[PDB]
Amino acid sequence: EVQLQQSGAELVKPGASVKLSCTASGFNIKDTYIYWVRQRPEQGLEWIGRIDPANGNTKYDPKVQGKATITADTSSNTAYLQLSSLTFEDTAVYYCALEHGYYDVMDYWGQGTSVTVSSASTKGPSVFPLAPSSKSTSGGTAALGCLVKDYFPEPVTVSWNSGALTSGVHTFPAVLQSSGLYSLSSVVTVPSSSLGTQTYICNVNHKPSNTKVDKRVEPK
Amino acid sequence: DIVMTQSQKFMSTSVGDRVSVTCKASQNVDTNVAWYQKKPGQSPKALIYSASYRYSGVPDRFTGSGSGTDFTLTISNVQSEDLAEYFCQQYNSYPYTFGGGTKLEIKRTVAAPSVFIFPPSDEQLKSGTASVVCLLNNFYPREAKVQWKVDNALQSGNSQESVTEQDSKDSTYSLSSTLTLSKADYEKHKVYACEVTHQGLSSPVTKSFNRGE
Secondary structure, rough: OOOEEOOOOOEEEOOOEEEEEEEEEEEOOOEEEEEEEEOOOOEEEEEEEEEOOOEEEEOOOOOOEOOOEEEEEOOOOOEEEEEOOOOOOOOOOEEEEEEEEOOOOOOOOOOOOOEEEEEOEEEEEEEEEEEOHHHEEEOOEEEEEEEEEEEEEOOEEEEHHHHOOOOOOEEEEEEOOOOEEEEEEEEEHHHHHHHHOOOOOOOEEEEHOOOEEEEOOOOO | OOOOOOOOOOOEEEEOOOOOEEEEEEEOOOOOOOEEEEEOOOOOOEEEEEEEEOOOOOOOOEEEEEOOEEEEEEEOOOHHHHHOOOEEEEEOOOOOOOOOOEEEEEEEOOEEEEEEEEEHHHHHOOOOOOEEEEEEEEEEOOEEEEEEEEOOEEEOOOOOOOEEOOOOOOOOEEEEEEEEEEEEOOOOOOEEEEEEEOOOOOOOEOOOEEEEO
């Protein structure tokens, strides 16, 4: 039905500008108010603004007025959030939200777009297999995974078998290495009996470095 | 500056109990208050509108109440899937404001971790680096200690670890620890081990391998 798809994760320099997109499918946005909110570690969830794509009327939080500009293109069923003069404090996950008005609050949310404001350059991760072995099996179950090492900035997305494998998956929080680069691991437990007939592929996306890797994790 | 204050930053409950999340409005907002549920790694999901009206598909266990400045989200018959952060929000006057959020923690029985170890991949070794990963799966409570030992020598300053959020199905935690050495230092030793201490274990559990099978 209705699905909100936002643009990919970004890494922006201080004082630069970025334009985030929120494309709606399965619903003409002329019947909606489109919202943008951000999430920060301390400030929590913060309302940014709202647009009516039927007429273009916008209502902003006066704290971000001037720095944020929301537009909409009804032809593409897409709303935009333009951020100007980005400061280090603007690092956040930016959500777009859609509401009709009968139940009358943001009932459909996008997946969010992580924006990191930094002067450091992006780095693409290496993806190494964590192969199932006698040292990762017990009780008929086998643990396997992928090590996503040395990247900047967050986030990295990890799926298994293009999303078909979700049970028993653990994608751990990233750790900050001394170099300022991040590392994370993603693991899954599977039957040891079917390691010879099933195929396990971790799909790793790091948008700021255009990294898209499908690593097959083979036993032994 | 209509401030939505949620005084309870965290709340501990058990599967089947009842928990009430409070939301304090600095000004009168009548019943123009909504409640959201933010599961880990997911987008916020709208639970209640108009202070007390649940959404289509929301279970009857989520009940909202309140008027004016005092609001309450009640979760009866708490399920393990209810692990999330719960946010209140007023939409009575611009700018709309959200509460600080309340994290729901679920207490369960003690569970010892399953401990697994992964040698460095051949792919990484050709790159000149060797990472060894120790995995602690599905334990409770969250507190656990991992110690790396190389040739029976306790390691210090060359490892990083992180713990997951509570699992939405069994309320356990998982932990992954990575020991990273240069390939030259890795090939200098033989036995790599992570020693795990946890409340569910009567003695430390050692998971090891010998470099070279």
